[PDB]
């Protein structure tokens, strides 16, 4: 019983973290094979607008300090890769896992390995929000911390931390160097798109709650998916687009999605009157995959 936001075990990623220093900048890099991927702002100079191409043109390879623990890696080349630098080093990471890159979509869960000075410090599950930010915990020096998923022994890398938005949203790029949400790696006054609750994740959580005995919030009314969707974009919630993933839950609980959507509306107007399984009633951080894994182990 129980529902907890957890991370997948971090052992296979921990050995891929390095410290990347250049000038007065230090952050983290991801050492796979004979390359180190790291945010390109490590070669930027001030705290103005940055011409990364110029920064790279006036770069000296001997000015990099890249280390795994107390072992230093020699830098062979640097290429720009979107918001990342691809740094070729003279040593193969013998602990490189089987890995892939994948760019995640709003609503999807992954794992942050929060790193400082080239060493993992903490690990926690997160969920890509509809405005392409994650609700994380990062302070200066965290950039380069990887986001990953582990699937059948293959590490899927989906995130390297980049910046905190003026409000404290967290933004990274994928491992091809495309910034999530299109934000710039520039110390400028950009503001995030509106944060909405990912409704499909709310549905997974409400089903989890039913399976765990939480029923006080269950409406007897029903609302069609498309009618709810029109209300949602006026009430800070995403639209429901996929419903087949809920058939398994509807069958085990006897409660269909339409009753849950009606419950969601009724929770919006006494928002905070009671918790659900200990959480705020409209929690959107759990996916159906996470719920299945924790209720049934499959």
């Amino acid at each position: 019983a129980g529902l907890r936001k957890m991370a997948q075990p971090s052992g296979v990623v921990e050995k891929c973290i390095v410290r990347v220093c250049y000038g007065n900048m230090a952050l983290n890099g991801l050492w796979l094979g004979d390359t180190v991927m790291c945010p390109r702002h490590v070669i930027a100079s001030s705290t103005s607008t940055i011409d990364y191409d110029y920064a790279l043109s006036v770069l000296r390879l001997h000015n990099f300090s890249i280390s795994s623990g107390n072992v230093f890696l020699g830098v062979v080349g640097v290429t720009m890769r979107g918001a990342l630098l691809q740094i070729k080093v003279n040593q193969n990471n013998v602990h490189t896992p089987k890995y892939t890159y994948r760019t995640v979509r709003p609503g999807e869960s992954f794992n942050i390995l929060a790193c400082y000075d080239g060493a993992a410090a903490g690990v926690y599950g997160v969920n890509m929000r509809s405005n392409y930010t994650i609700r994380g915990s990062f302070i200066n020096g965290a950039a380069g911390s990887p986001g990953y998923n582990i699937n059948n022994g293959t590490v899927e890398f989906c995130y390297l931390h980049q910046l905190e938005l003026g409000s404290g949203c967290h933004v990274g790029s994928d491992l091809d160097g495309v910034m999530y949400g299109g934000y710039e790696d520039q110390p400028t006054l950009q503001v995030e798109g509106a944060s909405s609750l990912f409704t499909e994740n709310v549905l997974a959580f409400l089903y989890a709650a039913l399976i765990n005995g939480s029923t006080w919030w269950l409406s007897s009314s029903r609302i069609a998916v498309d009618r709810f969707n029109e209300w949602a974009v006026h009430n800070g919630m995403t639209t429901v687009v996929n419903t087949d993933c809920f058939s398994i839950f509807a069958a085990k609980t006897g409660v269909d999605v339409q009753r849950l959507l009606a419950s969601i509306q009724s929770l919006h107007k006494n928002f905070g009157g009671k918790q659900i399984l200990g959480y705020t009633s409209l929690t959107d951080e759990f996916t159906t995959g996470e719920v299945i894994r924790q209720m049934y182990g499959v």
């Binding site: 952050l27 302070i139 950039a143 980049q162 905190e164 003026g166 790696d185 110390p187 400028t188 006054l189």
Partner: peptide, 5 residues
């Protein structure tokens, strides 16, 4: 105001 970390 964005903070590069």
């Amino acid at each position: 105001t964005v903070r590069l970390q």
